[PDB]
Design a protein around this ligand. Sequence first.
Ligand SMILES: Cc1cc2nc3c(=O)[nH]c(=O)nc-3n(C[C@H](O)[C@H](O)[C@H](O)COP(=O)(O)OP(=O)(O)OC[C@H]3O[C@@H](n4cnc5c(N)ncnc54)[C@H](O)[C@@H]3O)c2cc1C
Ligand SMILES: Cc1cc2nc3c(=O)[nH]c(=O)nc-3n(C[C@H](O)[C@H](O)[C@H](O)COP(=O)(O)OP(=O)(O)OC[C@H]3O[C@@H](n4cnc5c(N)ncnc54)[C@H](O)[C@@H]3O)c2cc1C
Ligand SMILES: Cc1cc2nc3c(=O)[nH]c(=O)nc-3n(C[C@H](O)[C@H](O)[C@H](O)COP(=O)(O)OP(=O)(O)OC[C@H]3O[C@@H](n4cnc5c(N)ncnc54)[C@H](O)[C@@H]3O)c2cc1C
Ligand SMILES: Cc1cc2nc3c(=O)[nH]c(=O)nc-3n(C[C@H](O)[C@H](O)[C@H](O)COP(=O)(O)OP(=O)(O)OC[C@H]3O[C@@H](n4cnc5c(N)ncnc54)[C@H](O)[C@@H]3O)c2cc1C
Lengths: 379, 380, 384, 379
Amino acid sequence: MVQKMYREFAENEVKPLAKKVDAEEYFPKETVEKMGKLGMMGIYFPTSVGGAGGDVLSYVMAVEELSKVCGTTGVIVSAHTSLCAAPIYENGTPEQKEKYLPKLCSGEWLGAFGLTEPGAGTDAQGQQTTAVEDGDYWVLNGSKIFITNAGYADVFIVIAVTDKVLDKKGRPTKLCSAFIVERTDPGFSVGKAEDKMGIRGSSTCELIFEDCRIPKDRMLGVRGKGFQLAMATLDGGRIGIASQALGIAEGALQETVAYVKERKQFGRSISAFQNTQFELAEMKARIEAAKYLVYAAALKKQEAMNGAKVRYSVEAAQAKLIAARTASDVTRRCLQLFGGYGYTRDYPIERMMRDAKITEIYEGTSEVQMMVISGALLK
Amino acid sequence: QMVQKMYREFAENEVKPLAKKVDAEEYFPKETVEKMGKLGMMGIYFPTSVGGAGGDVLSYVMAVEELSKVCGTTGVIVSAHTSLCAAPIYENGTPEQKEKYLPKLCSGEWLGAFGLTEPGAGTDAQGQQTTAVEDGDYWVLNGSKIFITNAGYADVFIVIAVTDKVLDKKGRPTKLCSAFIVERTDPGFSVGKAEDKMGIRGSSTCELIFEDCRIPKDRMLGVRGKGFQLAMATLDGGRIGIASQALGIAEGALQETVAYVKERKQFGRSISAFQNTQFELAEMKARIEAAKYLVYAAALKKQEAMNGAKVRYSVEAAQAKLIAARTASDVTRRCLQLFGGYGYTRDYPIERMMRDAKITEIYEGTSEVQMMVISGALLK
Amino acid sequence: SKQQQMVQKMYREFAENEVKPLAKKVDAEEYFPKETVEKMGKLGMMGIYFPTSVGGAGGDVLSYVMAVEELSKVCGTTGVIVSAHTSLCAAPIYENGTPEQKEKYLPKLCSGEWLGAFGLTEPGAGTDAQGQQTTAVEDGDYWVLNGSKIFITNAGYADVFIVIAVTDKVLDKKGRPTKLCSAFIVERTDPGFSVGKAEDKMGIRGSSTCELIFEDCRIPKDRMLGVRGKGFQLAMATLDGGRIGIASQALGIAEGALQETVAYVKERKQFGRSISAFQNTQFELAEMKARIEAAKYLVYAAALKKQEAMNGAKVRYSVEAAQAKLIAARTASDVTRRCLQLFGGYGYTRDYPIERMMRDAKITEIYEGTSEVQMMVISGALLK
Amino acid sequence: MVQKMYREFAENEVKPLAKKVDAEEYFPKETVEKMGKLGMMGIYFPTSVGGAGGDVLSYVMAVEELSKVCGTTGVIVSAHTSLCAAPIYENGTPEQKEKYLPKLCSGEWLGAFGLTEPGAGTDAQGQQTTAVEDGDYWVLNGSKIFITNAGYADVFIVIAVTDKVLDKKGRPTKLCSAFIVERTDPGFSVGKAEDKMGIRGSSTCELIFEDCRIPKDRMLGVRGKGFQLAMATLDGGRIGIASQALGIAEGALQETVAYVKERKQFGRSISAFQNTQFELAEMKARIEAAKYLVYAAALKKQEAMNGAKVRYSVEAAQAKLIAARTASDVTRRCLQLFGGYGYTRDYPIERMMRDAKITEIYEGTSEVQMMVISGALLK
Ligand SMILES: Cc1cc2nc3c(=O)[nH]c(=O)nc-3n(C[C@H](O)[C@H](O)[C@H](O)COP(=O)(O)OP(=O)(O)OC[C@H]3O[C@@H](n4cnc5c(N)ncnc54)[C@H](O)[C@@H]3O)c2cc1C
Ligand SMILES: Cc1cc2nc3c(=O)[nH]c(=O)nc-3n(C[C@H](O)[C@H](O)[C@H](O)COP(=O)(O)OP(=O)(O)OC[C@H]3O[C@@H](n4cnc5c(N)ncnc54)[C@H](O)[C@@H]3O)c2cc1C
Ligand SMILES: Cc1cc2nc3c(=O)[nH]c(=O)nc-3n(C[C@H](O)[C@H](O)[C@H](O)COP(=O)(O)OP(=O)(O)OC[C@H]3O[C@@H](n4cnc5c(N)ncnc54)[C@H](O)[C@@H]3O)c2cc1C
Ligand SMILES: Cc1cc2nc3c(=O)[nH]c(=O)nc-3n(C[C@H](O)[C@H](O)[C@H](O)COP(=O)(O)OP(=O)(O)OC[C@H]3O[C@@H](n4cnc5c(N)ncnc54)[C@H](O)[C@@H]3O)c2cc1C
């Protein structure tokens, strides 16, 4: 009753704004605040922490419905929910939960997450942002690159190097910890918005820590287990991105069906040619196959959230790998069915193709997803 | 999930040892068909009230999938018998027809088969010319069916024949078909020689010849003139079974490949240690899971329709049949590569799984047909 | 290979020195590179395979194909600016023009002072090139053109246009009314002719693609190019040459993307090593280069068939072009997407050119005949 | 002329034996008898060693036309020519040339080549068959596996380990040497024919060396340079296999175009549907692109053998990679167009798909070809 339900909720919230968001690199604060007033920034979190008391699948559906019409809007929510609000709720203390989750789930605060560094993006373990103890404070130094929501975010999750310890075989190893960084923390700046191929309305900025001293109780999770917390967070985030890729491919298919039904070239609708029919049919099935992967991932996560001791990293990895590749594949072929008109800004299909490309890259590339799947498989 | 591990144990202990002989000798596995019947597996999702085992459609799907992991021949025998012969009788039969055929069919004493395809028109399933004529209290059948699964070993057949000669309101001449239950002991009915196929070679794929086949009046299944509608509703359920067959062939191919690359060594390391091997297996695994969810989703939409929920599952079946068949052919080809030269010989079963995977793209409606069904609903 | 390897270098140096430093500004600013076209004109690169007798540079068709390839390795916009100008405006004039029409337009087209363009596509039917409605009517000593063309490359900066208009309304063998077309040389200065709204496009954004408007466009009688009623056959013989140019543009985009990728993966590190030390990166590059090399041979072969036809050997090259256009365009889109993948997040930003190349590669599958058109050409010949 | 005419020769040889050669695992010895008398066993070899005096391209065309009808016949010629006769000519002394090349190019002697071992197939540098000096003789011991033509071959090229030396810095390494082995050499045995998925008429057997005492002069090439001789031999053979794959795909496309013109389902030919036309058109374009790669490599090796000093390993690697992947893809999509009739032995398409599978593996798998190509590219 929450799953079937919210799908219409999210379907009615629609996209008269997607063209200007993309064309003008414009962050949609109107949509974000409407979402806060609607509970869409706190969906699967319990009401005891400020959330809307929904389930993980309803969150996935919301992202997918938004991403059908604006990939940028889907990633703003997804990143804020899965990458900032989720690790607080999943590893934070009652005090940490109460101080941060009510304002994140209501929309009052926007959340971001910084792991990626210039030389340690895929090698997220070999990073160089550091954190040292100073009495009752921590002192951070370094930078984070390509951080979603960063220009408009109020709270940031930051992974920094806290200890340099030894491994079993004497090789020095770096241990990280997660830190809750507020936008007002001194010595913390947000750089300029990057110029991207797509999801342009999304604020992708650099983080700069120049002696950012934060209170001692901003440490999230177990000291030195920050890498494990980061990888656990990305597992939930990868379900979010997979649901984004799914909506882009679904939105692209939606528009293409409408277009081929009305345009006629040889005296008949373009939909009357067999090639058009087979392309749309094969694409739809591929999209359906990806939809169930995404849906299966979301509820395996729900199982883990409900106390069951199950792992969902593999399911999430499979979902993001297949959804992202399906999204790029569907958008390219759908643009083909538009002909020359699909190469212009009159229609959204060109934006959707640019937007689809990112889902294969960010929050862990497809290659990293295959490392996850094969690791479980070959073990 | 409890029935699934039963099937897995049965398929590995009782079916897998026989797959090589079944394929290499074009050997119908009469033995295991008797064993499965004793285990109630030829009637899985039919209720106990008609002689079934009282399972659900998915347990049947999981059984076909699990059998097909080790023997594509065994999987299709169960699938065709269940979805193409037993299902149409349960869906459109009279209480007399159900009580006579369903208990023996679900028990396994009688094997089932479906005749639709003819030589002149196989994809054009509405341009066929096998006929049934009124004669007193009997029907007279005449024609031929081609490529019939289980034909050489089936006791009861579902036969689609042209009965009425009508012409549509548009103006074009239209053939109306009817479905008929034909028993192997019928006069003027014979089964041809087994075809020589590329894969699923133990499956008995033969001709059906009707030369003045005289059958009773009460052998007509369903409404007169709707026989083609009966065939297309039967095929929708069958395509779910073929989808789970393709899924199982891909699943078993990957399983053997993962095993092989861990133990076989090259350049000093296991082949599993090379990044290209890991990514091929990873990508194939994700594609197989995507197909699996499609298959189970279709199986449950059909379960809804069987429980009273008036939904259609044609498109869900069409999607599952389409994706799972192309995944099977893709996976087995790439899995064979990871075997190297050893995968080209009969020592391993990868070459049989590749040959078995191709048929899933074709029979019970080609992938092109599946795209016709899907786009017809989408573009409506 | 030949001293054609000497001219191949010219296009590579020129692309790397004069064109490559401008590609980002061309794309980001939707900026027609008016400075490079003038440079290429002074270099005779807008007349490459036309003879000196008609004031070209006296090269071969293969040289022009490589010129487009080398330019499209760095800037797809610059590549298509030459390709349409050469293969879609100057080629039909040279192929079907009277000595006056040749002497008048070719000296300016091959020099660079005049830029060319081709109008076929209309809104109501672009793929269905037999159902258009731009009309041309006899009026005394002049022709009167009315209608519109859409998507025309170079339209906002071109001086002379090849326009296909419906002249003859004739009855066919089956009794249906068929429309016959004629080709006309329209100068930017003709009364009643206007280039119109440009297009904000996905890629090749520096290219000037605008609509053409004919509102009582009155042009001389001797502007007609070719025979009356056979303008459509002229347009399809023009497109056969142009599809070789776009196949080379696609080939170049795929080639330049691979060069950039191989450079990036050798210098960028992770997990202790260079990204080129991982097997997946190696097999991705190796397979793309093998596909690209196969597309090159198709493109190059279509060029030689075209040059065989020009040298008097009566041979058809429409299938060879369609094969080139189909495979090269699908290779470009595939290579650029997979190359961007190997860049990680850095490929999604404007810092590097791979995202521009991926956006540019998508057009080669579409303009001057979609890939579905190409397959129609190829299957028609095969099933005949 | 030698190109445009030998195409006519090769297109003409017609035997209706392909079906039973593959169905009965029957080596077509009469076909080899006929081809030897036509001079098809030494085509590109000069007349002063006993060849026909043809070019490398005609050999490629002979394999391509034979493989268009019977992939088994194409591989017998290719293996015998490119893997046994070629290294005799290219590395043998005039004494070795005079003794072996006339009978090989005339078809009296069938050639074979052994490099692959049970544990060193892709890792052809880590094998264990050895050869030691004994008076005026060598002694060979070990085993080779998967050796084409071995069941009916008279002369064999055997790679054996002759020296274990130290490399530049100090690791022990194994050096190999080539050896000409005759069928009548004592202690040399041929095993049973393997049961293969396809090219089943070809004699794929194991070689066993139990005190294979051969005269001292049967050493081929420079001592300790056997492995270098191996890869250079496989370079030529890879062009041959590429031709086979090209032939298989071409013959596949041929039968399919014929079949779709004649078969009617919906009141019109299956050629009349758009899906069929696009499938055939795209495959034709794919095949044509492979054909150029095969020919280009063939003429690069013709340059080689005319004295010009260029390497054709990369060209041969690209040719085999693309052709093998095009053959498999084409045969599968052509079987689809046959419908249920293509799954039976009535038509040759299913045998074609089984034959296409082999070209991706032997004489260097696609992964080995990508190792070669990326080696040159990344260097
Ligand atoms: C950047 C750009 C520059 C251009 N420059 C020029 C120029 O300089 N000159 C010029 O003349 N044109 C130009 N064009 C137009 C271009 O050639 C057309 O866009 C192209 O021919 C496709 O036609 P269309 O855009 O009208 O789409 P449509 O014709 O509407 O095609 C829509 C889709 O339907 C498919 N389709 C159509 N008919 C069939 C059929 N019978 N069977 C199956 N599928 C079918 C098409 O392949 C396509 O996928 C340009 C276009 C672009 C985008
Ligand atoms: C092993 C095996 C077992 C079988 N078992 C059974 C059984 O138990 N019962 C039964 O009834 N049948 C059975 N068949 C027959 C099978 O169902 C038919 O063969 C199949 O439905 C179509 O095959 P065909 O050759 O008749 O179709 P064809 O139409 O001859 O197919 C030729 C090709 O044309 C394509 N095509 C056809 N029409 C169109 C169109 N309008 N648009 C585009 N493409 C089109 C098809 O997709 C196919 O690629 C079996 C076949 C095999 C091989
Ligand atoms: C739009 C956008 C939003 C982003 N948002 C965020 C955010 O909110 N939070 C955050 O922390 N980061 C974010 N990032 C950064 C992002 O996480 C990284 O870009 C991504 O994870 C990969 O980082 P990279 O590009 O440095 O990796 P690189 O390692 O530079 O990737 C280059 C290529 O090498 C491959 N590769 C690397 N190692 C191997 C290997 N061992 N084997 C095979 N292939 C390998 C990769 O898969 C890729 O194909 C964002 C990036 C973008 C573009
Ligand atoms: C019909 C047939 C005929 C043959 N005829 C001959 C003949 O005449 N002469 C001869 O010498 N040989 C012959 N062979 C052997 C053939 O050359 C080998 O089968 C082939 O080279 C692969 O070696 P393998 O079979 O040991 O596979 P393996 O090396 O056991 O397989 C390794 C697999 O892993 C893949 N892979 C991916 N990454 C790597 C990596 N980093 N390192 C290693 N592998 C990797 C490989 O591509 C391959 O798929 C024949 C084989 C067959 C099937």
